[PDB]
Amino acid sequence: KLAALDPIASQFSQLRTISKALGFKDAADDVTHCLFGGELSLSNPDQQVIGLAGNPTDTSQPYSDLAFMDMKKLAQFLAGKPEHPMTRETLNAENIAKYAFRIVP
Numbered sequence: 001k002l003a004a005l006d007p008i009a010s011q012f013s014q015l016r017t018i019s020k021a022l023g024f025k026d027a028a029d030d031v032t033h034c035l036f037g038g039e040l041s042l043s044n045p046d047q048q049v050i051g052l053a054g055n056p057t058d059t060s061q062p063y064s065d066l067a068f069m070d071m072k073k074l075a076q077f078l079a080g081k082p083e084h085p086m087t088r089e090t091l092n093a094e095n096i097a098k099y100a101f102r103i104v105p
Helices: 009-014 071-080
Strands: 014-018 047-054 066-070 098-105
Touching: 009 047, 009 071, 047 071, 066 098
Parallel strands: 014 098
Antiparallel strands: 047 066, 047 098
């Protein structure tokens, strides 16, 4: 079937990364919840787990305060309101990589 490629969520694989090893407690009871609701897990096949910073930095200085979330939910939010969900500063496809870090094992 036809499927949309979201202009923001399609950047997930290009993001700067931060290892699983900031309060992230993967689900698989103290667990980190996404900003938009529900527990987060690197093993959840339907989530793209990121940390979203409150201030931007150039695409690749590594990370140096994050909100954890599912980028899929973030992209849906930003398509309707292109603003950082906490600071309300402009946030869109153009600058998401300056704010978002993909969490890896």
